[PDB]
């Protein structure tokens, strides 16, 4: 079992766009040096969330066919996926990119940022759940593309156009599960389990934003 040359080409474009992300030194240094107070911890999180929006747009722009979509549909997809894409990238950075000590300090900062356990608990439950699947880089990149190119987001005018871009990605992901995990037929079902779990963050994030009187004007406009 192998990917077709067309599938290999689609995957390469996705992987290339995904591998561009790299946490800048200034943010990493802040996690280490800043005072351990609710306001300093929250500011670090806000900067990370803001930087992710820029990272998300750059990744999305290079997804095959994205630039062929109507301008308003490009905006609707970005707005619709911003929270889910953020948590998925977070799961990867917490479980793979940051060193043990830095991730331990970032978790300490997240847990002492003035954010309620109602939102912190499902967040860390999700990271552990993603960690269990021992996802490859190809799995992270494809899952991110599938999340972004979701045809059922609100305010999309040409859904059929989005469906034509999403279906080949789901096909590639299922085929990689059959190639790399043939002894584990439930592997693709497990990856799907993460897509639905990611959707639950849309509510948790919306409630968290309405709870502010901490107030970050820029992020509130992107997430509505």
């Amino acid at each position: 079992m192998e990917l077709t040359p067309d599938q290999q080409t689609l995957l390469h474009f996705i992987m290339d766009s995904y591998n561009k992300q790299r946490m800048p030194q200034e943010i990493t240094n802040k996690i280490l040096k800043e005072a351990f107070s609710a306001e300093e911890n929250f500011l670090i999180l806000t900067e990370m969330a803001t930087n992710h929006v820029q990272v998300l747009v750059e990744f999305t722009k290079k997804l095959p066919g994205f630039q062929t979509l109507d301008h308003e549909d490009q905006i609707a997809l970005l707005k619709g996926s911003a929270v889910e894409a953020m948590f998925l990238r977070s799961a990867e950075i917490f479980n793979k990119k940051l060193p043990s000590g830095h991730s331990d300090l970032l978790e300490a900062r997240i847990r002492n940022s003035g954010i309620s356990d109602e939102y912190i608990t499902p967040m860390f439950s999700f990271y552990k759940s993603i960690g269990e699947l021992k996802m490859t880089q190809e799995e992270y990149a494809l899952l991110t593309a599938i999340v972004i190119l979701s045809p059922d987001r609100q305010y999309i005018k040409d859904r059929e156009a989005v469906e034509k871009l999403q279906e080949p990605l789901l096909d590639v992901l299922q085929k990689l599960c059959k190639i790399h995990q043939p002894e584990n037929p439930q592997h693709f079902a497990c990856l799907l389990g993460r897509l639905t779990e990611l959707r639950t963050f849309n509510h948790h994030h919306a409630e968290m934003l309405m709870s502010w009187r901490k107030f970050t004007p820029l992020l509130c406009e992107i997430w509505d």
Partner: peptide, 11 residues
Amino acid sequence: DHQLLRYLLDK
């Protein structure tokens, strides 16, 4: 509306 996303998308 969506002024930041519009700018990032054009850049």
